Amino acid sequence: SIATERIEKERMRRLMAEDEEGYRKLIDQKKDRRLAYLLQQTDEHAISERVEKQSALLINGTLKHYQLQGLEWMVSLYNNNLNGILADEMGLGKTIQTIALITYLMEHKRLNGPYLIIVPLSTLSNWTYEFDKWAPSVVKISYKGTPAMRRSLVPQLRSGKFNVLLTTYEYIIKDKHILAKIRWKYMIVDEGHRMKNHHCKLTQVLNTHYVAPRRILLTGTPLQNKLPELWALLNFLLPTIFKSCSTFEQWFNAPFAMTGERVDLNEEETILIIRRLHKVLRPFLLRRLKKEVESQLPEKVEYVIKCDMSALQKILYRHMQAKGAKTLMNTIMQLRKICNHPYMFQHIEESFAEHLGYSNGVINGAELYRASGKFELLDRILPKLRATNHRVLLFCQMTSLMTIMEDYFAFRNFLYLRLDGTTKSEDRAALLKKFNEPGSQYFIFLLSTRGLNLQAADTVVIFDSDNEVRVLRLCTVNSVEEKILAASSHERRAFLQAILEHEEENEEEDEVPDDETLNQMIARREEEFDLFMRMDMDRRREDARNPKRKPRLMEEDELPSWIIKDDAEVERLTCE
Numbered sequence: 001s002i003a004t005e006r007i008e009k010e011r012m013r014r015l016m017a018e019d020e021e022g023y024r025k026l027i028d029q030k031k032d033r034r035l036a037y038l039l040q041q042t043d044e045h046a047i048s049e050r051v052e053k054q055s056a057l058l059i060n061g062t063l064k065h066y067q068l069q070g071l072e073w074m075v076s077l078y079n080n081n082l083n084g085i086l087a088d089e090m091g092l093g094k095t096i097q098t099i100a101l102i103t104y105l106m107e108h109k110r111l112n113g114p115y116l117i118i119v120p121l122s123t124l125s126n127w128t129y130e131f132d133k134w135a136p137s138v139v140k141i142s143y144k145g146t147p148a149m150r151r152s153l154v155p156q157l158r159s160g161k162f163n164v165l166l167t168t169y170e171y172i173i174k175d176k177h178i179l180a181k182i183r184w185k186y187m188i189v190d191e192g193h194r195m196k197n198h199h200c201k202l203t204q205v206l207n208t209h210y211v212a213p214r215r216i217l218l219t220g221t222p223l224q225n226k227l228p229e230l231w232a233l234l235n236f237l238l239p240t241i242f243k244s245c246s247t248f249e250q251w252f253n254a255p256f257a258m259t260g261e262r263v264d265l266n267e268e269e270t271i272l273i274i275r276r277l278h279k280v281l282r283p284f285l286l287r288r289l290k291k292e293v294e295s296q297l298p299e300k301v302e303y304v305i306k307c308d309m310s311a312l313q314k315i316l317y318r319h320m321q322a323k324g325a326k327t328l329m330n331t332i333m334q335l336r337k338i339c340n341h342p343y344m345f346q347h348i349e350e351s352f353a354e355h356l357g358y359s360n361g362v363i364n365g366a367e368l369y370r371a372s373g374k375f376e377l378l379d380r381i382l383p384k385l386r387a388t389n390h391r392v393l394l395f396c397q398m399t400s401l402m403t404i405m406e407d408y409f410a411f412r413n414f415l416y417l418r419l420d421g422t423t424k425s426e427d428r429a430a431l432l433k434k435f436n437e438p439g440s441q442y443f444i445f446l447l448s449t450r451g452l453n454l455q456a457a458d459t460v461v462i463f464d465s466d467n468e469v470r471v472l473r474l475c476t477v478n479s480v481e482e483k484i485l486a487a488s489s490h491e492r493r494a495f496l497q498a499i500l501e502h503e504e505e506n507e508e509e510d511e512v513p514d515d516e517t518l519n520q521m522i523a524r525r526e527e528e529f530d531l532f533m534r535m536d537m538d539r540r541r542e543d544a545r546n547p548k549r550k551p552r553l554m555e556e557d558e559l560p561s562w563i564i565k566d567d568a569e570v571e572r573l574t575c576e
């Protein structure tokens with residue numbers, strides 16, 4: 001192999017010198033051999049099963065007829081030993097159909113797994129919520145977090161006491177020495193809306209190191225017309241055709257490695273490769289549009305949206321954590337206030353205004369939303385919802401927070417009504433009538449979670465918890481808010497300490513969604529998504545022009561030297 005490479009190298013170097021026309025005749029012969037081969041390998045009855053019901057293990061909702069065919073389709077794939085792409089439009093039950101598959105195979109094929117599901121990090125909590133709702137019997141692992149955390153889980157893996165494991169791209173790559181070893185019965189991956197640049201590296205590693213018989217690719221976009229992408233799709237769906245862990249550019253150039261001379265396809269040659277790969281992949285792709293199944297669309301569409309913390313949120317959080325019975329119950333109240341807004345702490349707001357350039361000591365404008373992950377995220381939801389004439393219902397369990405909520409709506413000029421436990425039955429009735437009468441210009445209905453029929457509201461933003469209706473629960477990243485979503489006086493104290501088991505993290509991937517994932521959860525149609533994408537770039541235009549540009553979240557570099565390493569000061573400003 002060195003001996004041959006040394007010689008075959010000198011062979012190519014000697015033709016370049018002594019018969020340049022013969023050297024050209026060879027390379028053009030080699031180029032065509034790669035094409036002819038590519039075409040030749042791709043130039044190529046089935047087992048029936050009818051699926052009348054869903055799994056008995058699938059509960060708390062019954063499948064739509066179209067989703068039933070999705071299940072029946074992916075089962076047909078299974079029996080006939082095939083891979084697939086479920087590419088249904090956004091909001092049609094791709095996550096619910098994947099759970100219907102696993103639960104059906106566990107029941108009727110006694111296939112207990114293990115099932116590997118790879119998802120974008122921002123939607124992990126979304127996946128884990130919808131498994132808890134629809135298939136709680138299923139035993140699942142969440143392989144992510146600090147090494148300490150990941151190692152904690154190795155016993156349960158070697159053991160094999162689990163049906164499903166969810167993880168993200170970095171852990172599939174970082175921890176191959178743990179995860180590749182497992183003998184996965186299934187390898188389901190979530191691309192999100194569209195293929196991203198980092199998915200080429202993922203395709204290669206997967207069929208370099210991992211051993212999964214069955215594969216599914218979940219996606220929101222239809223079959224693309226670019227060679228490099230479609231190569232990764234061929235080698236994920238049908239790896240046995242070319243048994244290669246390469247990019248198309250490397251695979252095609254393989255024979256010219258010793259030439260030291262790259263080879264590039266022309267217009268005619270490209271279109272043909274693309275037109276073929278299209279024809280090879282087409283039969284393996286099921287895509288139903290919202291309009292095709294209009295009379296079966298889900299009535300309630302739920303999603304979980306994620307928040308970073310401001311630099312301020314972090315420092316306050318770390319303080320109230322490492323300072324910590326109904327004392328615990330109290331420590332969980334303070335951590336919820338921070339995730340909600342740091343300026344709930346009056347003395348923190350006043351001192352920061354002095355430093356942000358407000359003599360008066362009352363924060364206003366953008367600086368309201370900039371100090372809270374959740375408020376900053378809400379600022380990217382509500383404008384969009386309003387621009388599509390959607391009428392929101394926003395739950396806020398804390399009556400303290402509502403002062404800051406009202407001041408935020410004031411800033412963005414959102415017309416609203418408020419309803420608390422400080423509202424009499426006479427006042428209540430009238431407020432509801434005002435929101436519900438046809439034409440009401442009242443956009444938001446701010447509520448304190450204490451019976452009330454707001455049929456006028458077609459959107460529900462849960463802000464802090466314990467005729468299609470879109471529900472959006474906000475949730476802070478690596479916070480208590482994650483732990484509350486996951487749902488004997490010695491054991492009821494050990495439960496409140498399981499709520500408090502925090503660990504500081506430094507993952508690679510963003511735990512907050514990009515603009516495409518987010519507008520997919522807010523939007524009910526292709527027009528809403530399209531608009532929201534423009535509204536997002538309109539915000540990037542506004543910021544670009546603005547002379548005094550600040551990031552959307554307050555970062556450490558713009559903090560005062562009196563909050564940075566001063567457990568006294570934080571305590572001096574937070575206490576009551």
Ligand SMILES: Nc1ncnc2c1ncn2[C@@H]1O[C@H](COP(=O)(O)OP(=O)(O)O)[C@@H](O)[C@H]1O
Pocket residue numbers: 061062063064067089090091092093094095096097130298299300301302303
């Ligand atoms: N057959 C159904 N019955 C009840 N709710 C459903 C059904 N199908 C989907 N939903 C709801 O609609 C939403 C669909 O989420 P999902 O389809 O998994 O995400 P996406 O379609 O964006 O991949 C969820 O809130 C789910 O509970």
Ligand SMILES: N#Cc1cc(C(=O)Nc2cc(F)c(=O)n(CC(F)F)c2)sc1C(F)(F)F
Pocket residue numbers: 085087189190191195199200201202203204206217219221222223224225229230231232233234236285
């Ligand atoms: N994540 C990840 C990931 C995404 C992959 C991919 O093939 N995306 C492509 C490539 C297309 F060409 C295309 O048309 N589409 C749309 C089609 F589904 F109709 C998708 S492969 C992969 C893996 F293996 F890394 F997990």
